[PDB]
Structure 1
Amino acid sequence: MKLNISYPVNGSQKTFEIDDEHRIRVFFDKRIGQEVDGEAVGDEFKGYVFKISGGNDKQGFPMKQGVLLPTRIKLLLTKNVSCYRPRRDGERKRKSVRGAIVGPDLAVLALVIVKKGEQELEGLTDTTVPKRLGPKRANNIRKFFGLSKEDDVRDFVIRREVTKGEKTYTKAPKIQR
């Protein structure tokens, strides 16, 4: 099955394919959340630790934290819940859901790194992707730089350059509160 891995430190992510029930089999009878030692899956990830966060079975239905079961069921879903986006106020819709217990019927595991193993992984530890947006509300700037209500934000706001072709520009948020 395909593994979809994330390094939530660097914002990095890359997918890996694994064909070998034995290597896979570590993930079986494991729930979402449960941690997993690396070497069992590959020599690459040795002493890497994996958190199981979800994934989609074949036919693409998603998992749902804490159903338990390693199958599918048809839950009633609401506002503010996984695997569903209401189309209308107070709308609820019955929908098939994959369990949160990993079977070999999954198309994809979704995983998140928690400890870094002994070796670097190419598109993950090596590369780092910047956070897209910066602090916009007053005291959030004051806490991304630690400032006290003295230092005055206005000059501590982020500043994102950009080019018009021959006119390079400058645009900062709009501090609120």
Structure 2
Amino acid sequence: MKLNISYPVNGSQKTFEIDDEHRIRVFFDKRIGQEVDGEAVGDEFKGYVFKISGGNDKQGFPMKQGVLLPTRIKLLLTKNVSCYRPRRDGERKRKSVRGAIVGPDLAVLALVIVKKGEQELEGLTDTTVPKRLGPKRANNIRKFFGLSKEDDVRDFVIRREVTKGEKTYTKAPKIQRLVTPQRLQRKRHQRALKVRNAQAQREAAAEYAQLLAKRLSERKAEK
């Protein structure tokens, strides 16, 4: 029926639905990521290769990968597959899920779109995402451009400014792994320790063999 249809390039989606019989049912008998034609789906598209991306049914079940039997089955769902929001630390579960090849079971089906092609940016492509969480670690800040990494960033920080403190904060992701002391202080405090203690055990060792040999001077000469 309805179709949540997403899009990987800059970022937009919405949900579509067609009522006609096999116009909405050209989809089935192939499972995930194969192909969707353009004329059978709503008339905006024309022969555009689509990574069809799993379905949802009535009773709210998802469809994950460990299927190829076209019914609702039951299995053991540990860590990576659809479950776990939330449970605790063993934690397996026993869970049923609707799986494979789609048809007269679908309620909404998830789509993603490789080829817009010619027509229909206006519901699927036409705007980008105002992408929220920019790069924080110092190298991938520069990997936003490839800034020829000796830049000394605090140059092109990802600034977001909104004036609710009436100062707009002029601030950045609070960047991570800057090439500066006192991080450089910490690595030189490493060799400040590892020379001190390793020598001090040796000058404790050079004391002990001296004290033992003077003891051995009477021990081996016990007459």
State the TM-score, normalized to the length of structure 2.
Answer: 0.72
The CA deviation string for residues 30-66 of structure 1, in whole angstroms up to 9 with x for no partner, is 2122222222212212233321111211111001124
Matched residues, number:
177
The answer to whether the 8 A contact 2:36-2:47 is kept is no
- Cα displacement string for residues 54-105 of structure 1 (whole angstroms, at most 9, x for unaligned residues): 1211111001124122211111100122244451113110111111322221
Deviation for aligned residue 1:107: 0.5
Contact 1:79–1:86, Cα closer than 8 Å, also in 2: no
Contact 1:6-1:14 within 8 A present in 2 as well: yes
Instruction: Tell me if the contact between 2:26 and 2:40 (Cα under 8 Å) persists in the aligned partners.
Output: yes
Deviates more, 1:83-92 or 1:107-116: 83-92
CA distance in 2, matches of 1:84, 1:107: 23
Q: CA deviation at 1:153?
A: 2.0
Pairwise CA distance, 1:159: 0.1
Following TM superposition, by how much is the alpha carbon of 1:9 offset from its aligned partner in structure 2, in angstroms? Answer: 0.8
> Equivalents in 1 of 2:117, 2:39: separation in Å?
9
Please say which structure displays the higher CA radius of gyration. Answer: 2
Could you tell me how far 1:110 is from its partner in structure 2? 0.3
Q: Which stretches in structure 1 are left out of the alignment for 5+ residues?
A: none
8 Å CA contact retained: 1:79, 1:85: no
TM-score, scaled to structure 1? 0.89
Give how far 1:168 is off: 3.0
- In the superposition, relative to structure 1, how do residues 49 and 170 fare at CA in structure 2: closer, same or farther (>3 Å)? same
Q: Percent identity over the alignment? A: 99
Is the contact between residue 57 and residue 106 of structure 2 (CA under 8 Å) also seen in structure 1? Answer: yes
Q: Which residue of 1 aligns with 2:158?
A: 158
CA distance 1:170–1:19, shift in 2 (3 Å): same
The Cα RMSD (Å) is: 7.2
Q: Who is 2:144 aligned against?
A: 144
Is the Cα contact below 8 Å between 2:11 and 2:125 reproduced in 1?
no
Distance between the aligned counterparts of 2:167 and 2:84, measured in 1? 44
Q: Distance in 2 between matches of 1:50 and 1:88?
A: 37
Shift in Å, 1:130? 2.1
Query: Which has more helix, going by share of residues?
Result: 2
Structure number with the bigger relative contact order (C-alpha 8 A, sep ≥ 6) is 1
Query: Following the alignment from structure 1 to structure 2, what is the Cα–Cα distance between the partners of residues 11 and 144?
Result: 17
CA distance in 2, matches of 1:81, 1:49: 26
Q: Is the 8 A contact 2:13 2:125 kept in 1?
A: no
CA contact (8 A) 1:163 1:169 kept: yes
